[PDB]
Design an enzyme around this catalytic site. Structure first.
Site, PDB file in Angstrom:
ATOM      1  N   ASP A   1       0.869  -1.185   0.103  1.00  0.00           N
ATOM      2  CA  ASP A   1      -0.045  -0.030   0.052  1.00  0.00           C
ATOM      3  C   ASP A   1       0.823   1.351   0.092  1.00  0.00           C
ATOM      4  O   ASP A   1       0.428   2.461   0.730  1.00  0.00           O
ATOM      5  CB  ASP A   1      -1.004   0.036   1.207  1.00  0.00           C
ATOM      6  CG  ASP A   1      -2.233   0.760   1.105  1.00  0.00           C
ATOM      7  OD1 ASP A   1      -2.850   1.196   1.942  1.00  0.00           O
ATOM      8  OD2 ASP A   1      -2.398   1.126  -0.467  1.00  0.00           O
TER       9      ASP A   1
ATOM     10  N   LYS B   1       2.157   4.533  -0.873  1.00  0.00           N
ATOM     11  CA  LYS B   1       1.821   6.012  -1.054  1.00  0.00           C
ATOM     12  C   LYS B   1       1.881   6.879  -0.262  1.00  0.00           C
ATOM     13  O   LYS B   1       2.139   6.673   1.003  1.00  0.00           O
ATOM     14  CB  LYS B   1       0.296   5.704  -1.643  1.00  0.00           C
ATOM     15  CG  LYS B   1      -0.660   5.552  -0.452  1.00  0.00           C
ATOM     16  CD  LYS B   1      -2.224   5.519  -0.738  1.00  0.00           C
ATOM     17  CE  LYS B   1      -3.038   4.867   0.005  1.00  0.00           C
ATOM     18  NZ  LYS B   1      -4.535   4.660  -0.361  1.00  0.00           N
TER      19      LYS B   1
ATOM     20  N   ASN C   1       0.585   7.058   3.256  1.00  0.00           N
ATOM     21  CA  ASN C   1       0.978   6.052   4.342  1.00  0.00           C
ATOM     22  C   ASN C   1       2.193   6.218   5.024  1.00  0.00           C
ATOM     23  O   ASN C   1       2.516   5.486   5.688  1.00  0.00           O
ATOM     24  CB  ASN C   1       0.661   4.689   3.912  1.00  0.00           C
ATOM     25  CG  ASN C   1      -0.885   4.533   3.651  1.00  0.00           C
ATOM     26  OD1 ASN C   1      -1.562   5.111   4.313  1.00  0.00           O
ATOM     27  ND2 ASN C   1      -1.044   3.195   2.722  1.00  0.00           N
TER      28      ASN C   1
HETATM   29  N1  LIG Z   1      -2.700   4.515  10.626  1.00  0.00           N
HETATM   30  C1  LIG Z   1      -1.662   5.414  11.128  1.00  0.00           C
HETATM   31  O1  LIG Z   1      -0.967   4.961  11.925  1.00  0.00           O
HETATM   32  C2  LIG Z   1      -1.935   6.927  10.994  1.00  0.00           C
HETATM   33  C3  LIG Z   1      -2.909   7.542  10.149  1.00  0.00           C
HETATM   34  N2  LIG Z   1      -2.844   8.888  10.248  1.00  0.00           N
HETATM   35  C4  LIG Z   1      -3.603   9.784   9.499  1.00  0.00           C
HETATM   36  O2  LIG Z   1      -4.497   9.399   8.754  1.00  0.00           O
HETATM   37  C5  LIG Z   1      -4.356   9.162   7.218  1.00  0.00           C
HETATM   38  C6  LIG Z   1      -4.846   8.126   6.564  1.00  0.00           C
HETATM   39  O3  LIG Z   1      -6.243   8.136   6.792  1.00  0.00           O
HETATM   40  C7  LIG Z   1      -2.703   9.195   7.403  1.00  0.00           C
HETATM   41  O4  LIG Z   1      -2.193  10.056   5.974  1.00  0.00           O
HETATM   42  C8  LIG Z   1      -2.422  10.465   8.438  1.00  0.00           C
HETATM   43  O5  LIG Z   1      -2.761  11.848   8.214  1.00  0.00           O
HETATM   44  C9  LIG Z   1      -2.039   9.026  11.377  1.00  0.00           C
HETATM   45  N3  LIG Z   1      -1.629  10.345  11.671  1.00  0.00           N
HETATM   46  C10 LIG Z   1      -0.825  10.334  12.969  1.00  0.00           C
HETATM   47  N4  LIG Z   1      -0.471   9.034  13.421  1.00  0.00           N
HETATM   48  C11 LIG Z   1      -0.679   8.082  12.797  1.00  0.00           C
HETATM   49  N5  LIG Z   1      -0.065   7.110  13.767  1.00  0.00           N
HETATM   50  C12 LIG Z   1      -1.680   7.953  11.752  1.00  0.00           C
END
Ligand SMILES: NC(=O)c1cn([C@@H]2O[C@H](CO)[C@@H](O)[C@H]2O)c2ncnc(N)c12
Ligand SMILES: [Ca+2]
Ligand SMILES: [Ca+2]
Lengths: 70, 542
Positions: free
Chosen positions: B311, B313, B316
């Site tokens: 995944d 991109k 992520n």
């Molecule tokens: N799955 C994760 O650990 C996270 C996903 N996002 C946000 O959620 C988006 C995915 O929908 C990302 O691009 C981030 O902006 C996060 N933001 C901060 N910490 C994280 N640990 C995550």
């Protein structure tokens, strides 16, 4: 909506109502927004307030803030 | 209303700045929430806990601190603690001062008249250490010595520690560690992203003030999509992988409507935000190269568990407080059976490798295709096969990925163009990273010519960008997308088994590290006058 959520919303409101007079002014909103690095105009601040200010007196009180948040 | 975007970020930043301010943001009742049990409530733990030195006094952070406190009450043991601390300092000492700090360790600890002589390390092993000191000393010089030290400590000191008040106190912390994790453990702040089975939001442990990200997997959504095994697999991979470059799991728990993964919060935001919402699209090659090297290390760590990520991109890849990255969302990660290929047309339009789009069988190769995509997009400020916000059919994007050459601008140095074209080789059998050396082939590519990967993996290279701790590197909350409600779906007793398997609660090492980091451990780990037993450790009565 629980007293828990009301109390949290009240704390968020107090982040804007810094003098505790029960209203958010354009001056208070501008202070918060400038702490976020934004530089809103006085008219932009008034527009944002007016969107939330239901009774039209030019400031946001806690009932209006609560209606926005819920 | 537009004000909601301001409220959401102001509230999040207030929480991130140590809460309201004092108690470091801990709840006013945090000492009641984390109140020790009376030692008599720990009997079953005392009976069932496995008395293993390596776990109790080293790998479990609180157990290590408590064993060290015990040792520091004994003059003959505190010398061994001192020696281990000096070995740790030596392991992180630059290579040209290695020789002299090793000499100082030798004369401080390992000569029969040294001021803090540690007699339990073999004189013969000391002489061997002396000899290899004098001829190119390296970071792992004193390991054998450290080993012998732990071999002394695991015997009589360990067994005295087990009978001490410090082990009783460890059992109390272990009782706390196993308490139920519920909705009320946490407070939820603004949503940060949407996808998968639900959404991700900032959250906070109420007792400790520690911030995390909460990935919320909606039960009804899982059930409508028959995603039970996918949800479980994501949790289990997150738990098993322990990599500097992958988001780590600290809690897994259940609510009435959701299953929740509590994950390292990444306050620098995601790389898509930095590519497109920080001025001109893209950023400089120095940054892209650093991020590429760390992503490659994270991919290597997953591939060591024979797990393909699938995944890749910009959304992520996330940035922490220091400007280092981690790979985040593991919802599409899969363990490949040793020696085999898997099948699965998964991923995001414009980011799926040709062998994925064609639904062929494949192994780790799509992750190297994805690394190519990430480098291209960081440098160019654009997908290789899609204009920025191009209104283009997914059919056309697929066609371009399968059929068209990606185009390189003046922004690319020759090495960057080279590594991108080699990673974006459409046929996987010829793709960079997909040969014998695996990631090693990528590490020696001239694009990474000035990248010391050993120092990077040891965290000794400074990131080129350090995020502002008071800024929110995320789209405004009103601009986060949202699923529609799931409908005609009904949770049964038939899912309860699945829920119980998922909701295992706190993860032991992250939980103890949270208690230490927030100074809940320091502030709660107290005793009575002159170090006497406090009432909670005093067997006679409460
Ligand atoms: N799955 C994760 O650990 C996270 C996903 N996002 C946000 O959620 C988006 C995915 O929908 C990302 O691009 C981030 O902006 C996060 N933001 C901060 N910490 C994280 N640990 C995550
Ligand atoms: Ca006011
Ligand atoms: Ca008003």
């Amino acid at each position: 909506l629980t007293e828990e959520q009301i109390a949290e919303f009240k704390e968020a409101f107090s982040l804007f109502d810094k003098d505790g007079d029960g209203t958010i002014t354009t001056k208070e909103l501008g202070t918060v927004m400038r702490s976020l690095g934004q530089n809103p105009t006085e008219a932009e601040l008034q527009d944002m307030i007016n969107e939330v200010d239901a009774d039209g007196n030019g400031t946001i009180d806690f009932p209006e803030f609560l209606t926005m948040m819920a | 209303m537009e004000l909601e975007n301001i409220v959401a970020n102001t509230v999040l930043l207030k929480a991130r700045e140590g809460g309201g301010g004092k108690r470091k943001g801990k709840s006013k009742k945090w000492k009641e929430i984390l109140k020790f049990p009376h030692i008599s409530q720990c009997e079953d733990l005392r009976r069932t806990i496995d008395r293993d030195y390596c776990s109790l006094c080293d790998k479990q952070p609180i157990g290590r601190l408590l064993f060290r406190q015990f040792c520091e009450t004994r003059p003959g043991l505190e010398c061994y603690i001192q020696f281990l601390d000096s070995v740790a300092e030596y392991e992180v000492t630059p290579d040209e001062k290695l020789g002299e700090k090793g000499k100082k360790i030798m004369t401080k600890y390992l000569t029969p008249k040294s001021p803090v002589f540690i007699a339990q390390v073999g004189q013969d092993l000391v002489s061997q250490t002396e000899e290899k000191l004098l001829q190119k000393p390296c970071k792992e010089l004193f390991s054998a010595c450290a080993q012998s030290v732990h071999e002394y400590l695991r015997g009589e000191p360990f067994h005295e520690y087990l009978d001490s008040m410090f082990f009783d106190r460890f059992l109390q912390w272990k009782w706390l560690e196993r308490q139920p994790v519920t909705k009320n453990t946490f407070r939820q702040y603004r949503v940060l992203g949407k996808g998968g089975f639900g959404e991700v939001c900032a959250c906070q442990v109420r007792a400790t003030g520690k911030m995390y990200a909460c990935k919320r997997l909606e039960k009804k959504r899982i059930k409508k999509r028959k995603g039970e095994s996918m949800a479980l697999n994501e949790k289990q991979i997150l738990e098993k992988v322990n990599s500097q470059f992958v988001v780590n799991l600290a809690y897994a728990y259940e609510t009435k409507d959701a299953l929740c993964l509590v994950l390292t919060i990444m306050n620098g935001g995601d790389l898509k935000f930095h590519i497109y919402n920080m001025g001109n699209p893209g950023f400089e090659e120095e940054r892209a190269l650093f991020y590429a090297a760390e992503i490659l290390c994270g991919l290597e760590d997953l591939h060591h568990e024979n797990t393909v990520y699938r995944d890749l991109k910009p959304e992520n890849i996330l940035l922490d407080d220091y400007g280092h990255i981690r790979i985040s969302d593991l919802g599409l990660a899969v363990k490949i059976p040793e020696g085999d290929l898997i099948r699965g047309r998964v991923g995001t339009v414009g980011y799926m490798a040709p062998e994925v789009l064609n639904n062929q069988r494949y192994g780790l190769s799509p992750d190297y295709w994805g690394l190519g995509c990430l480098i291209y997009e960081m440098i160019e400020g654009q997908s290789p096969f899609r204009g920025r916000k191009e209104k283009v059919k997914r059919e056309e994007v697929d066609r371009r990925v399968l059929e068209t050459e990606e185009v390189y601008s003046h922004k690319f140095s020759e090495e960057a163009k080279s590594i991108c074209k080699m990673l974006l080789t459409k046929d996987a059998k010829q793709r960079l990273g997909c040969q014998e050396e695996e990631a090693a082939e990528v590490k020696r590519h001239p694009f990474f010519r000035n990248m010391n990967f050993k120092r990077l993996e040891a965290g000794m290279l400074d990131p080129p960008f350090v995020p502002d701790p008071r800024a929110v590197y995320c789209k405004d909350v009103l601009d986060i997308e949202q699923f529609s409600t799931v409908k005609g779906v009904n949770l049964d007793h038939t899912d309860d088994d699945f829920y119980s398997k998922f909701s295992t609660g706190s993860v032991s090492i992250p939980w103890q590290n949270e208690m230490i980091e927030t100074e809940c451990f320091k502030e709660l780990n107290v005793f009575g006058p002159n170090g006497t037993l406090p009432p909670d450790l005093n067997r006679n009565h409460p």
